[PDB]
Amino acid sequence: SRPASDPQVVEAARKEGRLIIYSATDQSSAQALLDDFRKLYPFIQIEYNDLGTQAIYDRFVSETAAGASSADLLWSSAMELQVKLASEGYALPYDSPEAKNWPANARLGNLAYSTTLEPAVVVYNKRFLKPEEVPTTREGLARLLQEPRMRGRVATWDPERSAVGFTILKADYDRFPAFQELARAFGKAQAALYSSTGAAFEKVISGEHYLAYGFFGSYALLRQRTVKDLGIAYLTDGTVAIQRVAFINKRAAHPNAAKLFLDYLLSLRGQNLMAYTALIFARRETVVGEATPQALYKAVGGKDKVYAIPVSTEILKNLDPAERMRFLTFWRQAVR
Numbered sequence: 050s051r052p053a054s055d056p057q058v059v060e061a062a063r064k065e066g067r068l069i070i071y072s073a074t075d076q077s078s079a080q081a082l083l084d085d086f087r088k089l090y091p092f093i094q095i096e097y098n099d100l101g102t103q104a105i106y107d108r109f110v111s112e113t114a115a116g117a118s119s120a121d122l123l124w125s126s127a128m129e130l131q132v133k134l135a136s137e138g139y140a141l142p143y144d145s146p147e148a149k150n151w152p153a154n155a156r157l158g159n160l161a162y163s164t165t166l167e168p169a170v171v172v173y174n175k176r177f178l179k180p181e182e183v184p185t186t187r188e189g190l191a192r193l194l195q196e197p198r199m200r201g202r203v204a205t206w207d208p209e210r211s212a213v214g215f216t217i218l219k220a221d222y223d224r225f226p227a228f229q230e231l232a233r234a235f236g237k238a239q240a241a242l243y244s245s246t247g248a249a250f251e252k253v254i255s256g257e258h259y260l261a262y263g264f265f266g267s268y269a270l271l272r273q274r275t276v277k278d279l280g281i282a283y284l285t286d287g288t289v290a291i292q293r294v295a296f297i298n299k300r301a302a303h304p305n306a307a308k309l310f311l312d313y314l315l316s317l318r319g320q321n322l323m324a325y326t327a328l329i330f331a332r333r334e335t336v337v338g339e340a341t342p343q344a345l346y347k348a349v350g351g352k353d354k355v356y357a358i359p360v361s362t363e364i365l366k367n368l369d370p371a372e373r374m375r376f377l378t379f380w381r382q383a384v385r
């Protein structure tokens with residue numbers, strides 16, 4: 050069907066004719082969304098800048114201060130960075146008509162929106178770890194990582210070099226005491242730390258590592274369609290889900306193109322294309338496909354086992370010096 054964007058916003062977006070996106074969403078996953086939006090609105094030519102979460106922040110802030118040509122729309126899994134920008138005057142306020150049922154903890158009033166509910170999962174190479182061998186608990190994974198065969202065979206986030214690796218491992222540390230025991234097992238097994246999903250996945254695919262902890266269900270699902278040896282396990286003791294935040298650049302050259310794309314992302318049509326075709330874990334619970342809330346809830350044993358990190362100014366507490374220090378000091382000691 051068609052997103053409910055105001056007719057005058059559609060006309061204004063046609064007058065602009067262009068959309069510059071800075072996004073952390075790997076273009077392999079985002080591409081079907083771009084294709085489908087272009088079908089809907091063929092008079093908009095999309096520039097997709099596939100960038101790291103930190104590079105998106107640094108570049109946008111830098112370009113804004115220079116007064117330069119920057120993005121129309123920012124889309125990133127680094128939830129703290131997005132909520133910081135959107136709460137500091139970088140955001141165009143827009144009441145998306147596709148968000149009327151968005152929970153208040155899934156939006157920053159009209160300044161920024163959740164676009165997904167993406168689980169941090171375990172992926173593994175079935176040539177080296179059989180499904181029956183991969184625990185679904187932090188305590189279980191801590192036990193597996195005592196085995197001599199797992200030494201140098203574990204991949205996870207570097208939370209000091211990836212802003213979303215921070216978001217995910219911070220939420221994990223805050224919510225699950227058993228994360229402490231697991232982090233020490235990352236030490237024991239001499240886990241390697243990566244700043245992107247792609248770099249962790251390529252090591253699991255080659256067998257250089259057997260297991261990767263905390264990377265996006267979305268990317269795991271998509272990579273499985275081409276790599277039959279890739280397995281996915283969901284955490285039954287509790288799953289962290291990020292919500293990819295989209296907001297519009299207050300100083301966008303193409304504010305209405307950005308509005309149409311944000312509406313598209315939040316719409317039934319865009320959320321179903323996420324769930325079904327892009328294999329991005331959708332935010333709306335009324336979707337069909339592999340990458341849905343209902344599939345996530347089923348795999349982990351209930352919606353109550355999922356900690357969805359809120360799209361809230363309260364999460365800026367993770368950028369407080371004292372808060373950052375306690376987590377990174379614990380982490381560094383544990384994993385070296």
Ligand SMILES: [Mg+2]
Binds near residue numbers: 074075100
């Ligand atoms: Mg990416």
